Curated annotation (Swiss-Prot):
Segments for region (DNA-binding): 1-248
GO biological process: DNA replication; rolling hairpin viral DNA replication; symbiont-mediated arrest of host cell cycle during G2/M transition; symbiont-mediated perturbation of host apoptosis; symbiont-mediated perturbation of host cell cycle G1/S transition checkpoint; symbiont-mediated perturbation of host transcription
Keywords associated with the record: ATP-binding, Covalent protein-DNA linkage, DNA replication, DNA-binding, Endonuclease, G1/S host cell cycle checkpoint dysregulation by virus, Helicase, Host G2/M cell cycle arrest by virus, Host nucleus, Host-virus interaction, Hydrolase, Magnesium, Metal-binding, Modulation of host cell apoptosis by virus, Modulation of host cell cycle by virus, Nuclease, Nucleotide-binding, Transcription, Transcription regulation, Viral DNA replication, Viral genome packaging, Viral release from host cell
Domain-related comment: In the N-terminus, the endonuclease region is involved in binding to the origin of replication. In the middle, there are the ATPase and helicase activities. The C-terminus probably contains a transactivation domain.
Origin: domain of life: Viruses
Domain PV NS1-Nuc: 16-248
Function field: Multifunctional protein which displays endonuclease and helicase activities required for initiating and directing viral DNA replication. Also plays a role in viral packaging and transactivation of several promoters. Binds site-specifically to 2-3 approximate tandem copies of the tetranucleotide 5'TGGT3' within the origins of replication (Ori), unwinds this hairpin region and nicks one DNA strand thereby initiating the rolling circle replication (RCR). Cooperatively binds Ori with host PIF and probably other host factors, which activate the nickase function of NS1.
Record protein name field: Initiator protein NS1
Summary of subunit composition and partner proteins: Homooligomer; when bound to DNA. Interacts with human SYNCRIP. Interacts with host transcription factor SP1; this interaction allows high levels of viral P38 promoter transactivation by NS1.
Region (Ori-binding) residue spans: 186-190
Length: 248
């Protein structure tokens, strides 16, 4: 019952029923003119001050949440790419918040990097607050995908021609490398944005995942999480499970 675990549990419980959007930031493998662009081909560290600061936050979140009771053998390249994606995902969120003149402190958000059995690396984002309503979900997804595709092309470490960069930009947009949770539907039929409950989804689902400690990553595992209150960021896996247990 550390203050950190209690603090995280209370913070989430107060937001148990706050409706939020659910997004997934991802990428897909691309081959352009024989050039392979994989999930970890975005390793430029761009020298923009905010991005640098966000990347440092991801690094230290990893460092503080690392359990040294057990060894960790995640590839260095994998960690680096995840830290970079953490900074880029957040840059996208903050850019759209700016478009809407939304004060960051009026927003609840949660970010979790994972490795899916089929898709590999992806990043879940829950985000909402008083300035958010369900009808705005589609606009948010479209705007986030604009900034996501723009930053990915800037961060790509593969030498690309201008034609290739433009092609990559359009692929990341057209194939929706930012997805929005909707209710299940038919292809022809309308899709409706499906808001989720912030505290509940975090405590009962995202905090139940197993920590990735190897390369290749365990299917379904998580790398790294963070939130707008810096509450879950530094928690070790065992601490995360204690939060779920106390939340109930
Ligand atoms: Ni996932």
């Amino acid at each position: 019952y550390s203050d950190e675990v209690l603090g995280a549990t209370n913070w989430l419980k107060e937001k148990s029923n706050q409706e939020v959007f659910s997004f997934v930031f991802k990428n897909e493998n691309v081959q352009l003119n024989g050039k392979d662009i994989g999930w970890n081909s975005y390793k430029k560290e761009l020298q923009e001050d905010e991005l640098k600061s966000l990347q440092r936050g991801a690094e230290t979140t990893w460092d503080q949440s690392e359990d040294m009771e057990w060894e960790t053998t995640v590839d260095e390249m994998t960690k680096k790419q995840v830290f970079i994606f953490d900074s880029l995902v957040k840059k996208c969120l903050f850019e759209v918040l700016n478009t809407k003149n939304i004060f960051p402190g009026d927003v609840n958000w949660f970010v979790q990097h994972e490795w899916g059995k089929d898709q590999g690396w992806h990043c879940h984002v829950l985000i909402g607050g008083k300035d958010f309503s369900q009808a705005q979900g589609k606009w948010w997804r479209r705007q986030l995908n604009v900034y996501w595709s723009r930053w990915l092309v800037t961060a790509c470490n593969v030498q690309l021609t201008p034609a290739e960069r433009i092609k990559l930009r359009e692929i990341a947009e057209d194939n929706e490398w930012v997805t929005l949770l909707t209710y299940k539907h038919k292809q022809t039929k309308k899709d409706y944005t499906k808001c989720v409950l912030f505290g509940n989804m975090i405590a009962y689902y995202f905090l139940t995942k197993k920590k990735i400690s190897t390369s290749p990553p365990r299917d379904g595992g998580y790398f790294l999480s963070s939130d707008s209150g810096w509450k879950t960021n530094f928690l070790k896996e065992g601490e995360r499970h204690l939060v779920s247990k106390l939340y109930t």
